[PDB]
Amino acid sequence: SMQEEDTFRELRIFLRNVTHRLAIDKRFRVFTKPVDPDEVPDYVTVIKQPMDLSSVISKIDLHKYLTVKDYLRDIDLICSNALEYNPDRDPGDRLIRHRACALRDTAYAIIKEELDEDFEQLCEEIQESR
C-alpha cells in the first residue's frame, strides 16, 4: 500500500542519515570503501563476504533494507570481517579492531536513541507480510 511504501521510504532516509554520520567520522575511514585486491591480496583468503559503508549506501538505494535489523546485519558484517582479518597482537590489527568495535557500538547507539521502536516494529510487520 501507499502507507507501507511511505514507511520504507522513511526508513531509507533514516538509514542514509546514520550511514553518512558514520562515514564522515575520521575513525571509520578504513570502512568507507571496499578493500582493493591489488593493495591487499590476502584479504579474500580470509573474508568471503566483503562489506563497507559505500556498499551499504548502494544497498539502501536499491531498497535492500526493509528493517533496521537488515541494516544492522551489514554493519555487524563490517565489524566481524575486520575482527577476523585483524586477529593478531600487531598494533595495526589492534587499531582496526578498536575502530571496528567503535563503528558497531556507535551505529547501535544512534539507532537506540533515535529510531522509534514502534516504527521499527511496523517495518518488521510489513516485511513479515510479504
Ligand X SMILES: CC(=O)c1nc(NC(=O)[C@@H]2CNCCN2)sc1-c1cncc(N)c1
Ligand Y SMILES: CC(=O)c1nc(NC(=O)[C@H]2CNCCN2)sc1-c1cncc(N)c1
Give the interface with ligand Y as residue ranges (CB under 6 A).
30, 33, 35, 39-40, 82, 85-86, 90, 92-93, 96
- Cβ 119 vs Cβ 10: under 8 Å: yes
Binders of ligand X among residues 47 to 86 (CB under 6 A) are 83
Residue 98 interacts with which of ligand Y, ligand X, none, CB < 5 to 8 Å by class: ligand X
Nearest CA among 69, 75, 61 for reference residue 16? 61
Spatial neighbors of 128 by CB under 8 A, at least 6 apart, are: none
Q: Which span sits near ligand X by CB under 6 A: 39-47, 63-71, 95-103, 114-122? A: 95-103
Residue 39 interacts with which of ligand Y, ligand X, none, CB < 5 to 8 Å by class: ligand Y
Residue 28 interacts with which of ligand Y, ligand X, none, CB < 5 to 8 Å by class: none
Identity of the residue, 29 or 98, whose beta carbon is nearer to ligand X in the bound complex: 98
CB contact burial 113-130 (16+ within 10 A = b; e otherwise): eebeeeebebbeebeeee
Give me the amino acid identity at 98: H
Does 23 contact ligand X by CB under 6 A?
no
Residue 97 interacts with which of ligand Y, ligand X, none, CB < 5 to 8 Å by class: ligand X
CA dihedral for 125, 126, 128, 129, sign (positive or negative) = positive
Cβ 102 to ligand X shortest distance, Å: 4
